[PDB]
Amino acid sequence: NPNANP
Amino acid sequence: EQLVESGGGVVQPGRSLRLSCAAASEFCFSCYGMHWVRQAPGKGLEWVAVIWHDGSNQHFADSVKGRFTISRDNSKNIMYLQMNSLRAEDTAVYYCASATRYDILTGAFDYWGQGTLVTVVSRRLPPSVFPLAPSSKSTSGGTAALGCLVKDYFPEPVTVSWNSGALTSGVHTFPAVLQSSGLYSLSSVVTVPSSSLGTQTYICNVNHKPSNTKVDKKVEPKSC
Amino acid sequence: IQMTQSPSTLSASVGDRVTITCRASQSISTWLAWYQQKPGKAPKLLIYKASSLEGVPSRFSGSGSGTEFTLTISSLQPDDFATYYCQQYSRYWTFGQGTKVEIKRTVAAPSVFIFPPSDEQLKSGTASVVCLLNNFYPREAKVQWKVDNALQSGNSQESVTEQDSKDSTYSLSSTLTLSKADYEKHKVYACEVTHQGLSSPVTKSFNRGE
């Protein structure tokens, strides 16, 4: 997953 | 939130191009992985590349692997796409996209940009523009048709506006045809009231960036 | 992972219920997205993870799991003339080829105009005669070029616009191209148009020199 974990 | 791509243009095969994609500051650029999706003017969408949120990882389609590099400067809120070893296959419109809805896997691009056109050609010929004048033969009742013939140019595309963008209603710009010459040709027509030809002015603006050709042609009525 | 959509082109009337199927090479579980792209702008996301919508018209719907997925439109509105793409995001990100959704409206006859070659183009050695068919449906239309009441062959090219987003009609272009010397050897140039919406073939013409 290229998104940052919020 | 908004994405604006930049840096596209016309270059020869083998040359390099550095595309950028700037995000508006209302957009958490640091939060999401940034992608590149391109579309050849004819075919559909092809995913190209992605850089992680922190720049710690990146992936490339096998189509461009080994020739494209990707980077992002989170502080400047800009992602760069360095394209090297450009070929004819690389001619396309390049969108930058982002999937800002986190789950275990992400990839539903809710945000896109307008895209930048990249044309890889080694042959450029300017267009010749001729008026398609309204006459008694192009007046079906109260409606009159006029236009512009944009001929013998290469490569695609030519943008044609009427009166610098003020006139768009009833405008048809036909897809280009391929002549025997290997050059392209199209027409841009518009329908207007027949009663208005003596009082309104109609100028088609033809722009051809590969040849640095910008022309304006007043389409005067042939009163015939 | 390869994706495939069926069909590639689809025609339907306003109010009809249409269905688009997407097929995956290997089994993407539920990570699929459907996009709408009208030719003017970037694609707009419609649904994600196969079924979840956020394509705000409630008339869109998503189904599927494994390798078979489907997107359906409850009631077709004329604003939905576009190409629709499926995209998986289980193993990286790959798109489908797309599906063109044409709209079926009632018959509309074309308004026909003809343009003699401009004075500027004639001074350069070529004469291009343009015949225009504007705002008609269906797309099929026959254009004949007659020069001194003589049918022509092999010197004209045609061009069809995409379907208009508002009226769902087409406009057609027919360009007869001759050399200046060949153009001056004749007098009357006509364009005979055959189409479903026309009971009799309309003919726009002009006489050179006037």
Side-chain angles (χ1 to χ4, degrees), chain A residues 1-4 6, chain B residues 30-33 52-54 102-104 106:
Chain A
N1 194 316
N3 277 1
Chain B
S30 314
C31 289
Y32 315 112
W52 262 239
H53 59 279
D54 49 354
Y102 185 87
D103 205 289
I104 307 147
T106 59

Side-chain angles (χ1 to χ4, degrees), chain B residues 16-25 27:
Chain B
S16 281
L17 215 57
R18 180 173 180 89
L19 300 174
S20 325
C21 167
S25 85
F27 184 95

Side-chain angles (χ1 to χ4, degrees), chain B residues 113 115-135 138 141-175:
Chain B
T116 53
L117 179 67
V118 170
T119 323
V120 190
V121 292
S122 51
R123 182 200 187 200
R124 315 186 187 195
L125 279 153
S128 295
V129 184
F130 306 117
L132 298 165
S135 84
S138 61
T143 293
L146 53 99
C148 275
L149 180 53
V150 187
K151 196 187 167 100
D152 288 326
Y153 67 96
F154 192 92
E156 285 196 80
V158 285
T159 54
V160 48
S161 44
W162 284 92
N163 302 340
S164 324
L167 169 56
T168 62
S169 181
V171 168
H172 290 108
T173 302
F174 291 92

Side-chain angles (χ1 to χ4, degrees), chain B residues 2-14 16-25 27-42 44-64 66-75 77-86 88-100 102-113 115-135 138 141-213 215-219 221 223-224:
Chain B
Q2 178 130 19
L3 305 178
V4 200
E5 309 90 340
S6 325
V10 193
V11 301
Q12 280 181 40
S16 281
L17 215 57
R18 180 173 180 89
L19 300 174
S20 325
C21 167
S25 85
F27 184 95
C28 183
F29 196 68
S30 314
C31 289
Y32 315 112
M34 295 306 291
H35 297 252
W36 283 97
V37 178
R38 80 184 177 178
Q39 201 183 16
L45 305 165
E46 161 182 33
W47 180 89
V48 163
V50 61
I51 181 176
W52 262 239
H53 59 279
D54 49 354
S56 62
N57 203 1
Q58 64 290 297
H59 194 58
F60 290 97
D62 279 322
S63 187
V64 304
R67 308 151 53 218
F68 288 14
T69 49
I70 191 167
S71 79
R72 83 196 282 164
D73 195 359
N74 276 330
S75 194
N77 252 40
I78 301 148
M79 157 190 53
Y80 301 94
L81 186 61
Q82 183 66 51
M83 305 193 296
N84 311 303
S85 281
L86 287 179
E89 304 86 324
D90 293 338
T91 294
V93 176
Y94 281 76
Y95 308 86
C96 65
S98 174
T100 76
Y102 185 87
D103 205 289
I104 307 147
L105 293 172
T106 59
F109 310 119
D110 43 324
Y111 289 96
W112 301 65
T116 53
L117 179 67
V118 170
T119 323
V120 190
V121 292
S122 51
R123 182 200 187 200
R124 315 186 187 195
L125 279 153
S128 295
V129 184
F130 306 117
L132 298 165
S135 84
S138 61
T143 293
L146 53 99
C148 275
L149 180 53
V150 187
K151 196 187 167 100
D152 288 326
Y153 67 96
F154 192 92
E156 285 196 80
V158 285
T159 54
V160 48
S161 44
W162 284 92
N163 302 340
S164 324
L167 169 56
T168 62
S169 181
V171 168
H172 290 108
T173 302
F174 291 92
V177 302
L178 180 61
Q179 302 186 99
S180 308
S181 39
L183 310 185
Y184 295 95
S185 166
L186 60 73
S187 283
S188 205
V189 305
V190 57
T191 42
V192 298
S194 304
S195 54
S196 78
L197 301 175
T199 176
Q200 309 308 121
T201 280
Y202 299 105
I203 299 167
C204 82
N205 327 111
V206 177
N207 187 233
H208 191 246
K209 286 321 205 82
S211 70
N212 194 232
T213 306
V215 293
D216 295 340
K217 206 76 72 173
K218 203 182 61 213
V219 188
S223 36
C224 327

